[PDB]
Coordinates of C-alpha atoms and ligand atoms in Angstrom, one line a residue:
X1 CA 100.2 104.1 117.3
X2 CA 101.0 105.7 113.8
X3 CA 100.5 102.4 112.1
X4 CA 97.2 102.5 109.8
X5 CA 94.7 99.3 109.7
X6 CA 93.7 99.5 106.0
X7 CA 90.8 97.8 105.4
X8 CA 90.5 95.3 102.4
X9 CA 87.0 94.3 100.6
X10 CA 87.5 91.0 99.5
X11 CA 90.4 88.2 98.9
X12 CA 92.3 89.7 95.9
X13 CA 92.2 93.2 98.1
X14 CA 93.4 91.0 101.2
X15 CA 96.6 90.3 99.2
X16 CA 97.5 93.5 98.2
X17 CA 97.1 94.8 101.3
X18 CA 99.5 92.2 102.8
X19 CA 102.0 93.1 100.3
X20 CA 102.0 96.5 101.4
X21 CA 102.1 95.7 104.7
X22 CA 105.1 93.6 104.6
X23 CA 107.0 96.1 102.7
X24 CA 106.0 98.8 104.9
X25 CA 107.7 97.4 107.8
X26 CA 103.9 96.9 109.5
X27 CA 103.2 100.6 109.2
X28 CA 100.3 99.7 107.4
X29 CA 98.3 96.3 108.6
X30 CA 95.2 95.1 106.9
X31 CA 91.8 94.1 108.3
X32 CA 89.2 92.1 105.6
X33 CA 85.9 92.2 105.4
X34 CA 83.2 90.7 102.6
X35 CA 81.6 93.9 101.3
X36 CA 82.3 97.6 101.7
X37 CA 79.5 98.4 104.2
X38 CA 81.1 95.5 106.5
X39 CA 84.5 98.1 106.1
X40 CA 82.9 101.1 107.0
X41 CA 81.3 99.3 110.5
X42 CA 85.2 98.0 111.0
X43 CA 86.2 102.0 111.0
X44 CA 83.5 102.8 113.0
X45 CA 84.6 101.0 115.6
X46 CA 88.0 101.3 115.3
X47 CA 88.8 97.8 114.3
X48 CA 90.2 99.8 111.0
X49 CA 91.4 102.8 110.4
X50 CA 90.6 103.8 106.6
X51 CA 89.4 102.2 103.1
X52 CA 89.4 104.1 99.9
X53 CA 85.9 104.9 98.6
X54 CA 83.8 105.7 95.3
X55 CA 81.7 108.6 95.5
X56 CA 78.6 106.6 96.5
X57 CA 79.9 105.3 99.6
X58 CA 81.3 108.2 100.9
X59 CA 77.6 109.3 101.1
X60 CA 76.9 106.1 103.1
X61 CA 80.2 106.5 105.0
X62 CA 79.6 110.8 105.5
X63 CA 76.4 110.2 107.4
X64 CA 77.9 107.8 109.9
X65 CA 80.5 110.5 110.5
X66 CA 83.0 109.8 108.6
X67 CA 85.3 112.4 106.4
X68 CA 87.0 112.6 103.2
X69 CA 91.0 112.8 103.6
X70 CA 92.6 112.6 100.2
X71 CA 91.2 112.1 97.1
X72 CA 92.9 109.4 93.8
X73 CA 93.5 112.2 91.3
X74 CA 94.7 111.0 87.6
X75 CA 97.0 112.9 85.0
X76 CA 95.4 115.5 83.4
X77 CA 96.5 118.1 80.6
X78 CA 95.2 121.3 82.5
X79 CA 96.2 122.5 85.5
X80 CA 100.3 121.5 84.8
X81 CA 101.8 123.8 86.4
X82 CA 101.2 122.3 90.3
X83 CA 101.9 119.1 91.7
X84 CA 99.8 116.2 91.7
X85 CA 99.6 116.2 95.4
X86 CA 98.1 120.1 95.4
X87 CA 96.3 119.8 92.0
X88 CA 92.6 120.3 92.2
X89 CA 90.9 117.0 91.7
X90 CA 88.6 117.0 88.1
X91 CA 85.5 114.7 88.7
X92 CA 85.2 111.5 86.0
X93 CA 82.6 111.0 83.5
X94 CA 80.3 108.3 84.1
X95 CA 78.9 106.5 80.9
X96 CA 76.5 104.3 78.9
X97 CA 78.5 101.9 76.6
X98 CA 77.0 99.3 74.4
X99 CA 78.3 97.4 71.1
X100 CA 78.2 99.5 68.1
X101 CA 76.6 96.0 66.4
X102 CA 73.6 96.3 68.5
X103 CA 72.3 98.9 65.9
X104 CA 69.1 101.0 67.3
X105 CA 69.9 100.6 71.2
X106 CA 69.9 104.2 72.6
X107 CA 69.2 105.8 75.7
X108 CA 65.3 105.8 74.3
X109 CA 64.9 101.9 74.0
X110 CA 66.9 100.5 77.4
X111 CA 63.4 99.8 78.9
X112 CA 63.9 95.6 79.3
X113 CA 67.5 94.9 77.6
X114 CA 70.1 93.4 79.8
X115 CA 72.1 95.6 82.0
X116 CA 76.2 95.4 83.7
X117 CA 76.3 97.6 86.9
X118 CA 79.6 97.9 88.8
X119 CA 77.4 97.4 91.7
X120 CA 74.9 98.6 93.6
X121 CA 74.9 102.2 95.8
X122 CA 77.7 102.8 93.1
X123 CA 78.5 106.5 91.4
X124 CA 78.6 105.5 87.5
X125 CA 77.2 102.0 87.4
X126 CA 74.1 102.5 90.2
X127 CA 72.9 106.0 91.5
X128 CA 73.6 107.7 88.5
X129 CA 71.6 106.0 85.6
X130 CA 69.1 104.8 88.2
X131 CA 68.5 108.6 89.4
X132 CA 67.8 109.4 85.8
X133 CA 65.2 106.5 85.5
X134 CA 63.3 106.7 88.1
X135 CA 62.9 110.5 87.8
X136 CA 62.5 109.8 83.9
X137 CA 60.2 107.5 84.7
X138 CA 58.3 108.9 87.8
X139 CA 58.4 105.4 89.2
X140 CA 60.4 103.3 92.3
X141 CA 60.6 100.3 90.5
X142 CA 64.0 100.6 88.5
X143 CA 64.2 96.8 89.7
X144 CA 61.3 95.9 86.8
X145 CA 63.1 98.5 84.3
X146 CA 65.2 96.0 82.4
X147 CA 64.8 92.4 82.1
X148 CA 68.2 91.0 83.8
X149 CA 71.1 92.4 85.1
X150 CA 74.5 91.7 87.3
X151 CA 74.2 94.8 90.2
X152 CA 76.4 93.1 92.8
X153 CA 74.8 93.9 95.9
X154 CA 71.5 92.8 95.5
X155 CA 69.1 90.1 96.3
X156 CA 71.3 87.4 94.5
X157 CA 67.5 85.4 93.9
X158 CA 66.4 88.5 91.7
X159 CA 66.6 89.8 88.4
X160 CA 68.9 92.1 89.6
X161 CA 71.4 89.5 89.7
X162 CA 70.2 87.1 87.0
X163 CA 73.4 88.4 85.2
X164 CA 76.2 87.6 87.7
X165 CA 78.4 84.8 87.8
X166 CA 80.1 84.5 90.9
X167 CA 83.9 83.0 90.9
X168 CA 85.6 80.3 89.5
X169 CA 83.3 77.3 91.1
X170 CA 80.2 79.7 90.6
X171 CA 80.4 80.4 94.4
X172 CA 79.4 84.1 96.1
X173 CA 77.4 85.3 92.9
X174 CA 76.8 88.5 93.0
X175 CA 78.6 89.7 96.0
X176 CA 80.1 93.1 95.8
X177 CA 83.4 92.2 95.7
X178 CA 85.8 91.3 92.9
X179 CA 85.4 87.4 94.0
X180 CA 82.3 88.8 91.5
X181 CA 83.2 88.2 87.7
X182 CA 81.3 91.2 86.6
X183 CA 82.0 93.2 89.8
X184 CA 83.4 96.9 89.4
X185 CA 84.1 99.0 86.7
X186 CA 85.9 96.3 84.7
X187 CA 83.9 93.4 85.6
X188 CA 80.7 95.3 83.8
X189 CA 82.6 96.4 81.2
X190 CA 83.5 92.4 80.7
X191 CA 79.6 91.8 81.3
X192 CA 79.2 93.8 78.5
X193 CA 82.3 92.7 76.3
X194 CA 81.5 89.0 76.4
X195 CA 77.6 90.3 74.8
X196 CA 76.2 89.0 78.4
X197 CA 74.5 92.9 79.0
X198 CA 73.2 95.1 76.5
X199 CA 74.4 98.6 78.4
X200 CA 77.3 98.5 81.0
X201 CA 77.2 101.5 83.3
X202 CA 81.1 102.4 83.8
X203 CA 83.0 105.4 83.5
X204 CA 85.0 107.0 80.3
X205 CA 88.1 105.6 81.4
X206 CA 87.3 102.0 81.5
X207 CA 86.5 101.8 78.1
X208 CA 89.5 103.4 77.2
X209 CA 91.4 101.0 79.7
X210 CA 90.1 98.0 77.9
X211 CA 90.3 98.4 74.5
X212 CA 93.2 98.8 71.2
X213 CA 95.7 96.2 73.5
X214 CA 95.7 98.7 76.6
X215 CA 94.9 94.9 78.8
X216 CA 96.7 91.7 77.5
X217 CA 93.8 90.2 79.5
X218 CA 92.2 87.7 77.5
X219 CA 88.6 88.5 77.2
X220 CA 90.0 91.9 76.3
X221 CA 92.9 91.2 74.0
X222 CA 90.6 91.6 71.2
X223 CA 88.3 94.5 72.0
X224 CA 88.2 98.0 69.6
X225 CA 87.4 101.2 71.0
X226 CA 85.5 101.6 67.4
X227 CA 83.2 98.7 68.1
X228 CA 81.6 100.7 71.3
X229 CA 79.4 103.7 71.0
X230 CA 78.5 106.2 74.5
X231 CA 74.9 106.4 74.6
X232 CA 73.7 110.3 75.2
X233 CA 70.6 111.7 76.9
X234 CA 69.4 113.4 73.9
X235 CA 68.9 109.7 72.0
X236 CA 72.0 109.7 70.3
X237 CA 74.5 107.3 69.7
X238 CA 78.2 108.4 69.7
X239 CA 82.0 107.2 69.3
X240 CA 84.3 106.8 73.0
X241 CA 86.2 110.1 72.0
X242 CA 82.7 112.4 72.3
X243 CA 82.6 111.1 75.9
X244 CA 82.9 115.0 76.8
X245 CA 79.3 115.8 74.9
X246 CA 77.8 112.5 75.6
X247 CA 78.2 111.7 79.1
X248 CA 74.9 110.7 81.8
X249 CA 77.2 113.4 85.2
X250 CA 80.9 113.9 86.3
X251 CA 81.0 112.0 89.0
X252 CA 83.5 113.0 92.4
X253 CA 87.1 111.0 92.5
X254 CA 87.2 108.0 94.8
X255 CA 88.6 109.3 98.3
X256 CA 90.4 107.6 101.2
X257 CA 87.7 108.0 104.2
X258 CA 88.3 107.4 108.4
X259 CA 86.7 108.3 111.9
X260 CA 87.4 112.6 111.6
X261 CA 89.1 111.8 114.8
X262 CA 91.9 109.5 113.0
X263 CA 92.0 111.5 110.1
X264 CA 95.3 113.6 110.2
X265 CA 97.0 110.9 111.3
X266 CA 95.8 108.5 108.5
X267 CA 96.8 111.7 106.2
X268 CA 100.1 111.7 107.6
X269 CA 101.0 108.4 106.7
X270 CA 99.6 107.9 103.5
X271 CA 101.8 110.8 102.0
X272 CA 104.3 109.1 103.1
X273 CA 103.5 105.9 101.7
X274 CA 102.6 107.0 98.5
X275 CA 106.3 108.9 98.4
X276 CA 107.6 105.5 99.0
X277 CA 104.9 103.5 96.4
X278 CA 103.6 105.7 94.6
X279 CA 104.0 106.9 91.0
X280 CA 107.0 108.2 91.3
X281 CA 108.2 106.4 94.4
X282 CA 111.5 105.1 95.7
X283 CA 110.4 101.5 95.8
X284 CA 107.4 101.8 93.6
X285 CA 108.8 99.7 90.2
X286 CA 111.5 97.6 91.8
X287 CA 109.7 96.5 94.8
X288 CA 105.7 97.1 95.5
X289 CA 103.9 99.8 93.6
X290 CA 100.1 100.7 95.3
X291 CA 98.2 102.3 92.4
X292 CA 99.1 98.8 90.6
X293 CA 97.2 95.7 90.4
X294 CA 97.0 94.6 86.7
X295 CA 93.7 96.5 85.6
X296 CA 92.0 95.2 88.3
X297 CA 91.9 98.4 90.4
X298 CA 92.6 96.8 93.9
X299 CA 92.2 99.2 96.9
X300 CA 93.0 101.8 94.5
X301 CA 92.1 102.5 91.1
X302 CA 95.1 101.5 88.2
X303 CA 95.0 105.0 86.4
X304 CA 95.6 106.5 89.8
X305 CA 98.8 109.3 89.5
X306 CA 98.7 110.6 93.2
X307 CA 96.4 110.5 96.5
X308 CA 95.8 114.7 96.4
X309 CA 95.0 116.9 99.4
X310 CA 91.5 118.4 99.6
X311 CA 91.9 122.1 100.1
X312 CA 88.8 124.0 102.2
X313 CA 88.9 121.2 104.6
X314 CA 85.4 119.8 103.2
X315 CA 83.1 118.1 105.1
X316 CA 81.6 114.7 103.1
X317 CA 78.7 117.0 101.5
X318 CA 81.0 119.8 99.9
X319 CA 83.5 117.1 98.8
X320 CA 80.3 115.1 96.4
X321 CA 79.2 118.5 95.9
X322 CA 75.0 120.1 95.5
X323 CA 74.1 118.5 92.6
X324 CA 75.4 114.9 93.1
X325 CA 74.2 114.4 97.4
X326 CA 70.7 115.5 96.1
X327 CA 70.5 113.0 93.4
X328 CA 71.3 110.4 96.3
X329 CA 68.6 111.6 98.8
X330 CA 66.1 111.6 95.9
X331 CA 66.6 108.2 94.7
X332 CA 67.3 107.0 98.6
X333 CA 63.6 108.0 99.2
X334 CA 62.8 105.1 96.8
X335 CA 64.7 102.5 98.5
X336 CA 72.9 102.5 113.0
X337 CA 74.8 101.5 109.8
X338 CA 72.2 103.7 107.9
X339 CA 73.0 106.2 110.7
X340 CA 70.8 108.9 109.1
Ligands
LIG401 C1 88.6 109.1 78.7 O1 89.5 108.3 79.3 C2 90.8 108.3 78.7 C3 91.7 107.3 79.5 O2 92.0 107.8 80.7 C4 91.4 109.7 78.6 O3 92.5 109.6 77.6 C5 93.7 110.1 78.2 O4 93.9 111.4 77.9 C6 95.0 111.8 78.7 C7 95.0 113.3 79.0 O5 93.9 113.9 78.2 C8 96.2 111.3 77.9 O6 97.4 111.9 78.3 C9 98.5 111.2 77.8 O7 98.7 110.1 78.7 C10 99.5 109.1 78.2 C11 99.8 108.1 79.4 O8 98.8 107.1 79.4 C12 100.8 109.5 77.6 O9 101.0 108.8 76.4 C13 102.0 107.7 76.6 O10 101.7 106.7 77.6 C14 100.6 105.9 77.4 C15 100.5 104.9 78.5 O11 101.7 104.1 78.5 C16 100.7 105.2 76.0 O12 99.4 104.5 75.8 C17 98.5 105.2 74.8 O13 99.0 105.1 73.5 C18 99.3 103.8 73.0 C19 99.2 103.8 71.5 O14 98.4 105.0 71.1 C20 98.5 102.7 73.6 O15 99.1 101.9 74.6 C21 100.5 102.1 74.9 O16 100.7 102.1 76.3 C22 100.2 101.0 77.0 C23 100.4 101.1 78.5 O17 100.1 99.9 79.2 C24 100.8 99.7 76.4 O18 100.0 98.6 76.8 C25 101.1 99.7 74.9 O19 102.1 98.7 74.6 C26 101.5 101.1 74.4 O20 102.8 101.4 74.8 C27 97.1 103.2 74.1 O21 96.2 103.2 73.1 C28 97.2 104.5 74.9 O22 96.2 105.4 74.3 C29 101.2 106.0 74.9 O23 101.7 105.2 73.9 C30 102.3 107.0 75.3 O24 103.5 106.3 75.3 C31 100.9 111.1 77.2 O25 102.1 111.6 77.6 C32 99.8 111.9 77.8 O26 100.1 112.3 79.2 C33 96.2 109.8 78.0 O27 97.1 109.2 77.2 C34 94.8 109.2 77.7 N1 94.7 107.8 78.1 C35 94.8 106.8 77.3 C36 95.3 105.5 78.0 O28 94.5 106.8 76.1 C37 90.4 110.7 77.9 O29 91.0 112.0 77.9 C38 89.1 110.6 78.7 N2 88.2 111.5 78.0 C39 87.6 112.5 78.6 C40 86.6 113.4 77.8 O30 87.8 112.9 79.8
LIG402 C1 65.6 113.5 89.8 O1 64.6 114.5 90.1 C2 64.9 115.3 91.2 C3 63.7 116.2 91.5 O2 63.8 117.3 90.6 C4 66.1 116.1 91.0 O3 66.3 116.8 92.2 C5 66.3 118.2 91.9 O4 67.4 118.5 91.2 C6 67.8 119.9 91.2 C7 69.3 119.9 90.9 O5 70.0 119.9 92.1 C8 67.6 120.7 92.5 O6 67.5 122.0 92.1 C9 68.5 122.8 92.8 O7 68.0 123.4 94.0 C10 68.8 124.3 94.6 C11 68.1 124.9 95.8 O8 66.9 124.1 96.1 C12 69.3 125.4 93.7 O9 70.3 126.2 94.4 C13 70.0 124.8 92.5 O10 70.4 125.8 91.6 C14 69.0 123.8 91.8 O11 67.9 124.5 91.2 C15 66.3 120.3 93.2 O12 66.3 120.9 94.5 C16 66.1 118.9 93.3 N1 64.8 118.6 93.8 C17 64.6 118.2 95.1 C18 63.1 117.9 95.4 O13 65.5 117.9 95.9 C19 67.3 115.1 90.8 O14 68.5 115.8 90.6 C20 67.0 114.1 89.7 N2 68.0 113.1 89.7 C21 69.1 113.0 89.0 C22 70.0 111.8 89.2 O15 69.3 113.8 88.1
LIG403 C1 107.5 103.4 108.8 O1 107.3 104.6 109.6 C2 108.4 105.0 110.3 C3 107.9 106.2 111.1 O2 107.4 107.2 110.2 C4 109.5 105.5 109.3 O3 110.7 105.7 110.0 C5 109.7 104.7 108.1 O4 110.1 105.5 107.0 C6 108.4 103.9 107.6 N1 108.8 102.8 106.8 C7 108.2 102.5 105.7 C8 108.8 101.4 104.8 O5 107.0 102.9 105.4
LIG404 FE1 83.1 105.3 91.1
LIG405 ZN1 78.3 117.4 81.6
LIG406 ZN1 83.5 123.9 104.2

């Protein structure tokens, strides 16, 4: 009755989840489902109660009727007077990264180089740089715009996901899910890492996340900040530390979404949880910490301080803001369960 069904994208997720469950004394259960759209139809019918969401899926998610309860909010240097909890969420900066050794790539030349996309109907790796090239571009077919790519998402028979590699045995290629190799925010920065894209379409913090021994992970052991450059809209090429005068938008935080009609009740008990696993929790170190999962951002991204309240009670369109549903709708016209 106040127990939460969280629902899980994937395998890895499914874990997680059943970690949390356990040590939550089944006040949170888990439901799984293959991709996030298969999540959203579970809350939609009540099979699940919540999932938490990038920016681009909340679009999908705000249409069907569903709402924004809290939003991940990171450590910032401003605003440190309040608590995480109450502080006003900041946005992220989505990027263009490439290797500094691939001399003369800008923003200019991308037309048919190799591309990493977190996945597709994404903030930073999809409807951001794909809104700027079609408009740029004044054409619908951003699928002939560069030569191969991994979107996860797509038609796995397409360019679109000439890239991808699927798991271990090379199985579910390009699914969007982290069974995916170069799925998410850190699977195209490793698209881009291992030289298998040109351009990776991440946000600022990946990059950071990744690089100068932050990741102990293998294929990232070795990586230098100093051997990426951001690409900028005015054809310029800069360092990771300009990412505040060289990014392609600030995109909304990932939110926790549910049916408005389960919403304060899925509010209640997150608080809750996250005072118990959180941060700063009572169990979070010595026995199951949420915003964990070894850099691999599993139901919730890593850098993740707190889950914060959203203040003004918005509905899905204030929370993404103007600017950002428009550049959806626009590039939508290119392209129930699409339930307007
Ligand atoms: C682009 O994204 C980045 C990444 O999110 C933003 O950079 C962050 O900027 C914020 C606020 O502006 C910085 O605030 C600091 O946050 C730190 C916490 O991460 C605090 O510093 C301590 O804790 C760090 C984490 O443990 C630690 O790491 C940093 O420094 C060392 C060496 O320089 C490196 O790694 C160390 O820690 C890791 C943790 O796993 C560990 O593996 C290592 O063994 C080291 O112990 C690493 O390079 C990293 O930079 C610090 O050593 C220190 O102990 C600090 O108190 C303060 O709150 C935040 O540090 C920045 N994030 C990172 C990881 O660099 C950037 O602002 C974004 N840009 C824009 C324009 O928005
Ligand atoms: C790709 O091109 C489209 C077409 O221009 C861009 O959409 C346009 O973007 C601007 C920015 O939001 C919109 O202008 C705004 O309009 C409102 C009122 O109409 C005004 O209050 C704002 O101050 C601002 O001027 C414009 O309406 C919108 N055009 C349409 C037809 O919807 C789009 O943003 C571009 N894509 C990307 C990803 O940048
Ligand atoms: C489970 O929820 C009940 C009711 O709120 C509460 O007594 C308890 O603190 C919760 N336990 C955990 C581990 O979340
Ligand atoms: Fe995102
Ligand atoms: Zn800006
Ligand atoms: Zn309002």
């Amino acid at each position: 009755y106040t127990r939460v069904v969280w629902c899980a994208v994937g395998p890895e997720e499914q874990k997680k989840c059943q970690q949390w469950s356990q040590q939550s004394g089944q006040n949170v259960t888990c439901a799984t489902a293959s991709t996030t759209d298969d999540c959203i139809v579970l809350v939609l019918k009540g099979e699940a109660d919540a999932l938490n969401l990038d920016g681009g899926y909340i679009y999908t998610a705000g249409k069907c009727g569903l709402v924004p309860v809290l939003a991940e909010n990171r450590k910032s240097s401003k605003h440190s007077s309040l608590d995480c909890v109450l502080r006003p969420t900041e946005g992220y900066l989505a990027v263009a990264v490439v290797k500094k050794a691939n001399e003369g790539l800008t923003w200019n030349s991308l037309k048919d180089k190799k591309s990493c996309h977190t996945a597709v109907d994404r903030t930073a790796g999809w409807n951001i740089p794909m809104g700027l090239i079609v408009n740029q571009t004044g054409s619908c077919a951003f699928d002939e715009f560069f030569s191969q790519s991994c979107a996860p998402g797509a038609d796995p028979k397409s360019r679109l996901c000439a890239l991808c590699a699927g798991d271990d045995q090379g199985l579910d290629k390009c699914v969007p899910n982290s069974k995916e190799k170069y799925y998410g925010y850190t699977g195209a920065f490793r698209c881009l890492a291992e030289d298998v894209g040109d351009v990776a379409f991440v946000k600022n913090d990946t990059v950071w996340e990744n690089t100068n021994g932050e990741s102990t992970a293998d294929w990232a052991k070795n990586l230098k900040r100093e051997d990426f450059r951001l690409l900028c809209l005015d054809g310029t090429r800069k360092p990771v530390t300009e990412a505040q005068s060289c990014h392609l938008a600030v995109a909304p935080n990932h939110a926790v979404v549910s049916r408005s009609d389960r919403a304060a009740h899925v509010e209640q008990v997150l608080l809750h949880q996250q005072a118990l696993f959180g941060k700063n929790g009572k169990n979070c170190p010595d026995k199951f910490c949420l915003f964990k999962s070894e850099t691999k951002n599993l139901l919730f991204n890593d850098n993740t301080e707190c889950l914060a309240k959203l203040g003004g009670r918005p509905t899905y369109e204030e929370y993404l803001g103007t600017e950002y549903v428009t550049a959806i709708a626009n590039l939508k016209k290119c392209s129930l369960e699409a339930c307007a």
